[PDB]
Amino acid sequence: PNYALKFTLAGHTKAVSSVKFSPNGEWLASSSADKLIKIWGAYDGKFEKTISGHKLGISDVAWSSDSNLLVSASDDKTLKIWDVSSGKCLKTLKGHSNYVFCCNFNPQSNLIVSGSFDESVRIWDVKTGKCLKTLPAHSDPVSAVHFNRDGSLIVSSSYDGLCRIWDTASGQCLKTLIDDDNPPVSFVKFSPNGKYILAATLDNTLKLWDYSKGKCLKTYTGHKNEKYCIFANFSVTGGKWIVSGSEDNLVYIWNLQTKEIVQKLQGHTDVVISTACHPTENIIASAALENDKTIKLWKS
Amino acid sequence: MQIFVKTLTGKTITLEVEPSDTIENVKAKIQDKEGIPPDQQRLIFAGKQLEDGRTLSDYNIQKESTLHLVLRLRGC
Amino acid sequence: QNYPEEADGTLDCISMALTCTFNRWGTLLAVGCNDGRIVIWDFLTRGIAKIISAHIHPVCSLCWSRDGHKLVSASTDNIVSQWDVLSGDCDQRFRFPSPILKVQYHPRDQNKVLVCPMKSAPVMLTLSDSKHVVLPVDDDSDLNVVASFDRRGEYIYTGNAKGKILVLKTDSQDLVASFRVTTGTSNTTAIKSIEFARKGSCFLINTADRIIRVYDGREILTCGRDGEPEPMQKLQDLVNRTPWKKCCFSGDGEYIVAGSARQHALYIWEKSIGNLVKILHGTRGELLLDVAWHPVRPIIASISSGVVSIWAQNQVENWSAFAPDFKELDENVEYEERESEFEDEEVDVTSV
Amino acid sequence: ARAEVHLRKSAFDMFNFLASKHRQARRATSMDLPMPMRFRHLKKTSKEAVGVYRSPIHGRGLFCKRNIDAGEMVIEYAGNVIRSIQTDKREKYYDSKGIGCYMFRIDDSEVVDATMHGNAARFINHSCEPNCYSRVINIDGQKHIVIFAMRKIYRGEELTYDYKLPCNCGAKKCRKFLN
Amino acid sequence: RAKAKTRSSRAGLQFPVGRVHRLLRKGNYAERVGAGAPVYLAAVLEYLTAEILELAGNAARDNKKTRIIPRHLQLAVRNDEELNKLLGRVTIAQGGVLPNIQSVLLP
Amino acid sequence: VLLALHDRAPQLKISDDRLTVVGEKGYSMVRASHGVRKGAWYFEITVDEMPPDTAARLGWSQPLGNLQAPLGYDKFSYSWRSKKGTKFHQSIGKHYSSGYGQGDVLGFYINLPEPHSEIIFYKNGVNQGVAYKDIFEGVYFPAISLYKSCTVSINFGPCFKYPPKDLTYRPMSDMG
C-alpha cells in the first residue's frame, strides 16, 4: 500500500481501450481506438512498434502464453491474428455479423473464444483458422468470457443478470446462477485457482459467488460503476488487494479482508476503464478514456 | 493341535481341532462361529492345494502351523 | 456413468496409426505411426497438441514416464530413446537384436526401464548411465519371454513359452515364487502378455488356448516357490472361439476389456461376478491393432487400420441447466407445497 | 463499443429460448384403437413430433417437424395438479412478478399449473382459425388433457387453438376480446 | 452321486435344455449335435416369447381386462414392425383385423 | 347431526358411520350445512387420532369462502397454526399463541347477538389467545381442513365433555 507513479505511457490519440501484461511479466501492451496497437515495455514504458494494417477500429487485444502471438478484436467484424516479434497479419478471419468486445485463449493456446455483439459465442481454431463450435447463448451483447485453469470450462456474462458456465468439449450449458436484479453484468472472471468466480454488477456492488454451492460470500462497497463496464483483477504478490478502474478519476483498490475504504489512488482526468496486475511484481496499470489518453504506472 | 489359518486381509482363526479331524467338520464349525459359507475354504500348505476330502494326519502337518484361506467369488 | 455404449466419432487426422497409450491422468495420447512419427492429441480440448518426427522406420512400442515429461520407444531399428515433450530430441540410442517387443519404465522411478527382446532374455537397464542387467531365464531353450513390473514396483513377473511363471525380486534377482499354469489335462500352453491393474493386486494372463485367467497378486506371495494356485476367474468365448490380441483393466480395476484378433469387436466383462456385459462391434472387415482405456473416465481408444475410435457415452441434454427454477416433468404430479400457505468465513480463494 | 452506453439492457424474461437459428395409417396415435392404446405411445412420439421456436405472432410458439395427420394426438398438457384457490395467490403473485397466466382447468374442481412445472405444451399461441382442439380423457381413473388436431398439418406450420384484450392473431374471424 | 442341477439352472434360463437337445437328436437334422447349440437355441426361443408376451399383456391391460385372449396377440403382432415381418404369412384364429378405412370413402 | 352431501368436497374420507371425518392430502376445507346466524350455538371437535406431521386448521369460515380454501386465506376465515401459534389472516404473519396436544377435545365458540363478539381461541375452557375483533354479520360454517388422514370424531350431544366454562348456549338437538 505504497504505490507511487513512475512513468507515463503517452502516444494514444483516442480513448484508451485496454492495457494488459504479458504472461511472462515483461511486456505491458497497449491499444486505443485510433487503429493503433502499440507495444510497450513494463518497467519504463519503452517503445517497440505500433501494430496496424486494418480497415476499421479495434476493441481489444489478446495474448499468447509464450508472449509471441496475438489476436485483435477489431471492429471490421473480422479476427486478425497478430504477432509481437513480427507484426504481420497472420490469419485474416471473418465470422461475425456484428462487432466483438471480449475474446480470450485457453491456457494451451489452440482455441479462440469471441463473445460478440451478434451473440454467436464461437470457438475458433489457431492452426488453421476454421470455425469449430457455436453457442446460442444470450439475447444480449456478451460482456465477458473466460476459461478456467485447466481449460474445460467457459464462463459468460450478459446484460440481463445471467451467468452461465459452458463446457469446452461437448458445449452445452451446465450451471446458471440467477439474480433477482438485472443490471448489466460487466466483467466476471474465475479465481486464480479455478474454484471461485468474482462477478461485477451495475449496482455499485461486487459479489463473490461460490462456484459449486451457488451462493455469495462477501461484497464490496464505496465504488462508482453505473454506466460503463469496468474491469477488475486480483493480487497475489503482496496483499489480497482488488484493483479496478474508476469513474471519479481515482483508482479503485481494496481488500476483502478490509471490506471498507482503506486505500485510494488519485491523479486521473477521465474514467479509467481498464486496469491490469503483474503476476510476479507489484506493478499496476491504469488507463483512462479520451480526456486523459495517458497511462499511470503505479509501483510499490 | 491348535493350528492357525491367516487370510490375506490379516485375520487369523483359532481352531482348537484334534490331530485326526476332517475338513467338513471344520467347515461346519466355521459356519457355526462366523457365518462365512464353506464354498471358498481352499487352504494352502507350502503352495500345494489341500484337497477337500482329507484329514489332518495325511500331509504330515506340523502342530500349531499356519495355513491360508483364500476367498473366491462366483454368482450371477 | 459407467462402461461405454455408443460409437461416438473418430480421429481421422493422421493415417496409419499403430499403437497407443495414456498417461496417469488421461490428458494425453501418444501414437506411433508407419514412418517414425509420434502424434500427441488431447482429450481436454479434443485437438492435436504436438507432432514430433521421431525416425524414418515405424514405431511399435511407447511408454509414458511417471512425471509425464519423458517418452520412450522401441522401433524396428533397435532404437530406445528417452525423448522430450518440450524440445523433442533423441538422447540415447544403441542397437539390440533386431526384433524388440516391449519397453516399460519402473512404476516409481524414471531411471529403470525393462526392455523385452524377442529372441533374448529380459534386460533391466539404467538411465543415469549405460548399465544393463540381463535377467535370468529358467529354461534357456526357447528364448521367447515376456515380462513386466508390478503395480508398486517391488517385483517383476516373467513368463516363458512353456507356461512357467516366475517371480524375481526387482533389484537382487531372487527367484522366490513360481508356478506352472494348469492348462486342461496334461499339455502346457504359451504365455502371450501380462498386464496389471491400477488399484489393487489383481492381474491377468493371456495364454494361447484362448482363455484369459485372472489371478491375485497375494496368493503367489503366499504359495511361495513351485506352488499351485488356481485362478479367481476364467474368461473365454466359445461360440466364435475368438483368439485374443490385447487386454487391459478399467479405471479402478473393476472391468476388463479384451479385443479380438479375428472379427474387430471388443468384449467387456465384470471381475467380481464374471459375466459378459456388452460386446462393442464396429467395421465388419477391418483388423484390430490396439486397445486403450482412460484411467478416470469411460473412454476406449481402438486402433484399426489407422483409425482411432472413441466410445464416449453419447451426451444428450435437457432443460433446467438454462432455467434452474423450472422442473421439466413427464406426467402429472399432485401436491401442495407447504402446510402453512404463508457467516464471516474467510476461505482462501487462491489456494490450489 | 465500450463508450456508447445505450438502452435495451434488461428484458425481464424467464426463458432465453429465443435463439439465433429458430429453424421452424400405421402409428398407434392415429389408429382407431381405444384410448389407453394411444395414450401410451403418445409421450414417445411427442419428443420427435413437435418443437418450440421463435414465433412471429407473439413471442414463442409450437412448430412441428413432421406431418401430423388428421384427428390424431399431438401432445399432453401436464404440470402441477393444483386446486383452484392457489391459482388466485399465483395470479396476484405473478401479477407482482409480471409473468402471464398458464392455468388450464380440467373441470370445475382442479387446475393444471404450467409455470414452475410442466412440459412443452405451454408454448401454443392463440388464434381464431385454429387447427387443434382439446378433450379430457380417462386413463386408469386419472384424467388428462390431450391436444388433438383438425386437419393434415405440414412441416413448419404453427399449432394453435382456442383458449376460450387486443391479440396478434390477425385472423379474419377475429373477436378482439378474449374473455 | 452328487446333487442334480438341470442345465437350465446352470445357464440361467427358463426353457428346458434337455428337451431341446433330445428334439435335435431325434429329429433328423445332422449326425452329431454339439454342446452349446441347445443352450443357444433355448435362449433365442425365450427371448422371442418374452418379446411377444410384453406387448400382449400391455394390450390386455389397455382393454380393461386381466387375461389374454387371441385378440390381444393379434393387435400385438400386427402393430409391431418386425414381428409383422416374421409372422407375415400366418393366420391367427379368432383374431380379427385392424381398423382401417380408406380416405376417399368417408365424407 | 348429519353432515352435508353436495356443498362439500367429496374426495375426503367422510367415514361410513356418518359421525366421523377423516382428512386427505391438501387443505380441502369441508364445511357443514349448519352455519350460525344469531343466538348461541356450540359443539365440540373430538380428536380420536392424531399422528405426527398433522396440522389441523380449525375455525369458522363463511359461505363466500372456497370449498378448497385454506382456513386463514382472507378476512372471512381465521387460522391457528400448530407451529408456534402463528396465525395467518388477510396475509399477515404474527407469531401469536401456543399449540395443541394429541387426543384432546377441541371446539370453538362465537357469540353474535341480534354486534359485540367473543372471539378467543377456546381449548378445554382455557384461554389460548384473544384472536380478533369486530366482524360483520353473516354465516360461518364449521371448518374442517386437515393435512393428513387423522381420524377425528365430533360431538353433537348436549352433554359436552369439554365446553367453555359458564357458557350461555342452546342444545344441539334442534338444528338437525
Ligand SMILES: Nc1ncnc2c1ncn2[C@@H]1O[C@H](CSCC[C@H](N)C(=O)O)[C@@H](O)[C@H]1O
Ligand atoms: N397470438 C397471440 N397474440 C398476442 N398474445 C398472445 C398470443 N398468444 C398468446 N398470447 C399471450 O402470451 C401468453 C402465452 S405464453 C407466449 C409464448 C411464450 N411464453 C413466449 O412469449 O416466449 C398468454 O398470456 C397470452 O395472453
Ligand SMILES: [Zn+2]
Ligand atoms: Zn388478435
